[PDB]
């Protein structure tokens, strides 16, 4: 009696959404709203920040109204958590309260030249140079390099630089700013770790690097953890604070790939998960010891729950074309019309019958970092149908995530215990079979699959205390949200003929330049 609810804003790359969870851990209201994907010249990608905040508020109030429709006693939400696309960086004015320009997105490639200035000059040829600090190579992806491009290239931004009006944030910062009404100006540690400006081990700003990299430290917010006060919601954008009825607090903020880690319950070391948006991200919890490169791979914050409380670390690898690849074979190549034709065409053959397909359309980017690798297929005979190609594309995804976990077993010094998985592609029986084989671990597939949203809610649910122990959290997720589970069923030298084929094919992929 007296049912409690926490809210979460999943701000993504192509859309925004808000998801109300109960105390039993169920999404009970949801609403989605897209924003525009602006592409000036090839490789660029911008989002309108106002569009994002407007999206977030419409999600909010429409979701809240729907919960009332099905529970008329719902008076308020205890707290709101955030989670978001990371690296995407916003530029804004402190008293204009508003974007000086569109926000360049994580996978934009406008920063190409600025990356080479830095990796040559500041990095003395070594891209890794800053990596026992940031936990990251130098790339076009991370925040600081966007910040530069914006200080260099934008009339308004360079103008505001000097006048002391220039705030910079990741989307988590920018949401939490306008939501509170200009009141809050903070970031959580996981988001912070993406900026190329944080010290991974102290979880504090790196004044050597801000200075070395020519970004005025006063543009940055105060780092906090993922599970504490951040601001309050005081705005009426799309009737947002009126619909909340009480003043509700913001008590979770967390980067998206780490939000999926937390909400899949990967609290203990050697626990990992794999998300499928377009590509992939694989994240393993490594314990409290910050781990570092041997190959490439990323060192990042997993989650620090609470005021200076226990912090947890992780390694991160990407596959760049995963759900994309299945869609490419359909829309571009006409290999099959309907979605479940793919899964049944793959089953209609015993195996690849010789061939390998390396779905490296836009370079190769898990332990092997060849950006000249292109999409290649080798070993085809006249006895090769689309069924073999579809299966080979599936094998390839798992053969990459194999190489990734191998690298994780090295760098982390641990073994991979569990691997929970989630997305468009985790609803595919045959991949979670193959992958479970080639890696040789159980694989868990959650029936409450909204786990990235769940992550943030939990953070705010802990801070406000709808749950208090991670045992409580984990015990509800056992007594409620069903796992399906998938064992391995493939013999050591089936697996070694498949990797030997794989490593032989990888050699033939180098193409561009």
Ligand X SMILES: COc1ccc(N2CCN(Cc3cc(=O)oc4c(O)c(O)ccc34)CC2)cc1
The site for its own copies (CB under 8 A) is made up of 321, 324, 328, 332-336, 354, 361-362, 374-382, 384-386, 389, 504, 508-509, 511-512
Q: Out of 20, 272, 297, 408, which residue is the one contacting ligand X (CB under 6 A)?
A: 297
Rg (CA), the chain: 23
361: partner contacted, choices its own copies, ligand X, none (Cβ within 5-8 A by kind): its own copies
On whether 479 is known to bind a ligand per the annotation, the reply is yes
Cα 74 to its chain centre, rounded Å, is 31
Residue nearest to ligand X (CB): 139
Least gap, CB of 438 to its own copies (angstroms): 21
The half-sphere exposure of 485 on its side-chain side, counting CA atoms within 13 A, is 7
Binding mask 82-101 for ligand X (x = CB under 6 A): -----x--------------
Cα distances from 203 to residues 82, 123, 206, 337, 482, in angstroms, run 19, 22, 9, 49, 35
Residue 466 · residue 263 · CB < 8 Å:
no
Q: Is 24 annotated as a binding residue?
A: yes
Burial (0-12, 13-18, 19+ Cβ within 10 Å), 430: middle
Q: Binding partner of residue 321 among ligand X, its own copies, none, CB under 5 to 8 Å per kind?
A: its own copies
Contact between 490 and 437 (Cβ < 8 Å): yes
> Please, are residues 107 and 45 in contact by the beta-carbon 8 Å criterion?
yes
The answer to whether 316 contacts ligand X (rule: CB under 6 A) is yes
Q: Give the shortest CB-360-to-ligand X separation in angstroms.
A: 13
Give me 342's structure tokens: 């793919």
Residues 324-383 that bind ligand X (CB under 6 A): 365, 369, 371
Is 318 a binder of ligand X (CB under 6 A)?
A: yes
**Which is closer to ligand X, CB of 78 or CB of 422?**
422
Q: Please tell me whether 13 is known to bind a ligand.
A: yes
Give 7 or 137: the residue with its C-beta nearer to ligand X.
137
Among 317, 359, 423, 455, binds ligand X (CB under 6 A): 317
Residue 280 and residue 260: Cα distance in Å, rounded?
12
With CB under 5 to 8 Å by kind, the binding choice for 386 among ligand X, its own copies, none is its own copies
Q: 439 pairs with which residues across the strands?
A: none
Would the annotation count 256 as a binding residue? yes
Site for ligand X in 28-87 (CB under 6 A): 87
Chosen from ligand X, its own copies, none, partner binding at 298 (C-beta under 5 to 8 Å by type): ligand X
Considering CB distances under 5 to 8 angstroms, the limit depending on partner class, which of ligand X, its own copies, none binds residue 141?
Answer: ligand X
C-beta of 305: minimal distance to ligand X in Å?
22
Distance CA 347, CA 337 (A): 16
Q: What SS3 string covers 196-225?
A: CCEECCCCEECHHHHHHCCCCHHHCCEEEC
Which of ligand X, its own copies, none does 297 bind, CB closer than 5 to 8 A by kind? ligand X
Q: Of 426, 493, 82, nearest to 273 (Cα)?
A: 426
**Segment near ligand X (CB under 6 A), from 134-142, 226-234, 416-424, 503-511?**
134-142
Long-range contacts of 110-117 (CB under 8 A, 24+ apart): 110/43, 110/44, 110/140, 110/149, 111/140, 111/145, 111/146, 111/148, 111/149, 112/43, 112/140, 114/145, 114/148, 114/149, 114/152, 115/139, 115/140, 115/145
Q: Does 196 bind ligand X (CB under 6 A)?
A: no
Structure tokens at 21: 């969870």
Q: Does the footprint of ligand X cover residue 8 (CB under 6 A)?
A: no
Q: How far apart are the first and last CA of the chain?
A: 66
CB of 363 to its own copies, least distance (A): 10
* Residue 410 is assigned to a ligand binding site: no
User: Interface residues with ligand X (CB under 6 A)?
Assistant: 87, 106, 127, 137, 139, 141, 281, 296-298, 316-318, 365, 369, 371
Binding residue positions: 13-15, 22, 24, 26, 86-87, 256-257, 278, 424, 479-480
Binding residue positions for sn-glycerol 3-phosphate: 13, 86-87, 256-257, 278
């Amino acid at each position: 009696a007296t049912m409690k609810y926490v809210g979460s804003i999943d701000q993504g790359t192509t859309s925004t959404r808000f998801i109300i969870f109960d105390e039993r851990q169920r999404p009970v209201s949801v609403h989605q709203v897209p924003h525009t994907q602006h592409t000036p010249h090839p490789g660029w990608l911008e989002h309108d920040p106002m569009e994002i905040f407007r999206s977030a508020c419409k999600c909010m109030s429409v979701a809240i109204a729907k919960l009332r429709q099905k529970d008329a006693s719902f008076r308020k939400i205890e707290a709101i958590g955030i989670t978001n696309q990371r690296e995407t960086t916003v530029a804004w004015d402190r008293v204009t309260k508003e974007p000086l320009c569109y926000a360049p997105v994580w996978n934009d490639l406008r920063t190409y030249d600025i990356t080479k200035k830095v990796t040559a000059e500041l990095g003395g040829g070594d891209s890794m140079f800053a990596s026992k600090i940031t936990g990251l190579p130098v790339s076009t992806y991370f925040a600081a390099f966007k910040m530069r491009w914006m200080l260099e290239n934008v009339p308004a931004v360079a103008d505001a630089c000097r006048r002391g009006t220039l705030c910079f944030g990741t989307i988590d910062t920018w949401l939490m700013y306008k939501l509170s009404g200009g009141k809050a100006f903070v970031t959580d540690v996981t988001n912070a770790s993406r900026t190329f400006l944080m010290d991974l081990r102290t979880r504090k700003w790196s004044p050597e690097l801000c200075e070395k990299l020519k970004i005025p430290m006063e543009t940055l917010p105060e780092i906090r953890s993922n599970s504490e006060l951040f601001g309050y919601v005081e705005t009426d954008e799309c009737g947002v604070a009126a619909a909340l009825n009480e003043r509700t607090p913001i008590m979770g903020s967390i980067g998206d790939q780490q939000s999926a880690l937390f909400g899949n319950m990967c609290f203990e070391k050697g626990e990992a998960k794999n998300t499928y948006g377009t590509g992939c991200f694989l994240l393993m919890n490594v314990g409290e010891e910050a781990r570092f490169s041997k190959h490439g791979l990323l060192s990042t914050v997993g989650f620090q729950v609470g005021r200076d409380g226990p912090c947890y670390y992780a390694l991160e690898g990407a596959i760049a074309c995963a759900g994309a690849t299945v869609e490419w074979m359909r829309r571009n190549m006409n290999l099959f019309s309907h979605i479940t034709e793919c899964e049944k065409l793959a089953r209609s053959v015993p195996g690849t019958q010789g061939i390998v397909f390396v779905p490296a359309f836009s370079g190769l980017l898990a332990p092997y970092w060849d950006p000249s690798a292109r999409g290649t297929i080798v070993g085809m005979t006249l006895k090769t149908t689309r069924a073999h190609v579809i299966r080979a594309a599936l094998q390839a995804i798992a053969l990459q995530l194999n190489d990734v976990v191998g690298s994780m077993k090295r760098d982390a010094g641990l073994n991979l215990s569990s691997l929970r998985v989630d997305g468009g592609l985790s609803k595919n029986g045959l991949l979670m079979e193959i992958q479970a084989s080639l890696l040789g671990v159980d694989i868990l597939v959650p029936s409450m699959h909204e786990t990235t949203a769940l992550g943030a809610a939990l953070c705010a649910g802990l801070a406000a205390g709808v749950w208090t122990s991670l045992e409580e959290v984990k015990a509800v997720s056992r007594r409620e949200n069903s796992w399906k589970t998938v064992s391995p069923s493939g013999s050591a030298m089936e697996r070694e003929a498949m990797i030997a084929e794989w490593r032989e094919a990888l050699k033939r992929t180098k193409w561009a330049k």
